[PDB]
């Protein structure tokens, strides 16, 4: 009865703050799209743009915006088929290694905070050469280095 | 993705604060703490007699002895950035008693 | 030879906490099971209500 066409294990999404857009049939997918805002005030947009266009029409992320406000990002190579452009703030981007095998590329981001609130949700608008993709994303702090922080009373 | 498909209850429109919702932990059947929040199915569950409340359908019961939705608490951030109760419960929380309207 | 009601690992009571297996004693399980199998029929009469546990 649980192994039917409607199944609990099949409908699940990842346990991450980032929203996602695109079906398996869509040309370009954005996974894990989130607005990061560290406690020190710096902010940016984490996401991963994956190209799966079966026409092999390699794209280039022209721009990204949060509520129409610009986010800085540079040195974004074109994304040919079966390639991932991972984007995150520079401090968090430094924590993981760029893979020499595979098509992945790492790119840094930053945006001036207009006053976004932790907890809320804000639209995010991507525009690539082949079109625009819109998706609402939440605002949250980056993840702590696990195990280092204690509850401090004052 | 799950906050998109929330159904708001008539009169409880602005109680949430973004992603945050705040329901009463006391079951509306007999008052055990509900406390079993299924993170994917989004069903708040009561272990005492297996009531299931849909966290997306304003906490309305979906299974078990419970007949009534969990009351909701309005919340908002304060001047300093902590979370505060922005109001009182509009509905008597806990188990029902004889003179409780609805 | 057999442990019964090992209270030392349940902790003291406070109304905000509960366990998955929290049934009453065995001789009370019948009156628990009744409350589990009642199909939630509740009456509302203006200013009054008969709960589903009546």
């Amino acid at each position: 009865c649980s192994a039917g066409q409607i199944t609990q294990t099949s409908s699940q999404v990842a346990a991450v703050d980032g929203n996602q857009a695109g079906s398996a049939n869509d040309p370009v997918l954005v996974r894990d799209v989130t607005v990061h805002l560290t406690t020190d005030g710096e902010a940016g947009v984490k996401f991963t743009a994956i190209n799966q266009d079966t026409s092999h029409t390699s794209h280039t992320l022209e721009s990204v915006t949060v509520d129409g406000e610009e986010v800085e990002l540079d040195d974004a190579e074109p994304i040919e088929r079966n390639c991932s452009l991972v984007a995150d703030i520079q401090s968090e981007l430094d924590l993981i290694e760029e893979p020499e095998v595979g098509c992945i590329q790492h790119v840094a981001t930053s945006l001036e905070n207009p006053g976004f609130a932790y907890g809320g949700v804000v639209p995010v608008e991507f525009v690539f050469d082949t079109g625009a993709i819109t998706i609402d994303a939440t605002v949250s702090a980056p993840v702590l280095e696990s195990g280092v922080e204690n509850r401090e009373v004052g | 993705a799950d906050a998109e498909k929330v159904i708001e209850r008539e009169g409880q429109e602005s109680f949430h604060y973004g992603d945050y919702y705040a329901y009463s932990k006391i079951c509306t059947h007999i008052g055990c703490p509900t406390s079993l929040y299924e993170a994917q199915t989004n069903r708040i569950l009561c272990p005492c007699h297996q009531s299931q409340f849909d966290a997306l359908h304003y906490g309305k019961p979906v299974f078990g002895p419970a007949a009534r939705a969990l009351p909701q608490l309005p919340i908002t951030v304060d001047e300093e950035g902590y979370l505060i109760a922005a109001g009182n419960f509009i509905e008597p929380l806990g188990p029902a008693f004889w003179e409780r309207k609805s | 030879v057999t442990t019964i009601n090992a209270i030392w690992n349940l902790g003291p009571y406070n109304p905000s906490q509960v366990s998955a297996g929290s049934q009453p004693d065995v001789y009370m399980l019948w009156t628990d099971g009744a409350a589990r199998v009642m199909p939630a029929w509740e009456l509302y009469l203006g200013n009054y209500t008969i709960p589903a546990v009546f």
């Binding site: 809320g120 639209p123 | 159904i7 609805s102 | -």
Partner: peptide, 25 residues
């Protein structure tokens, strides 16, 4: 056999954006 006041809203919850006041800097 359902509560009279337990009615789903007509409002369709278009997003209400949130902000916090910024320091003068």
């Amino acid at each position: 056999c359902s509560p009279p006041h337990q009615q789903d809203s007509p409002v369709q919850r278009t997003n209400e954006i949130l902000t916090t006041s910024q320091n003068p800097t």
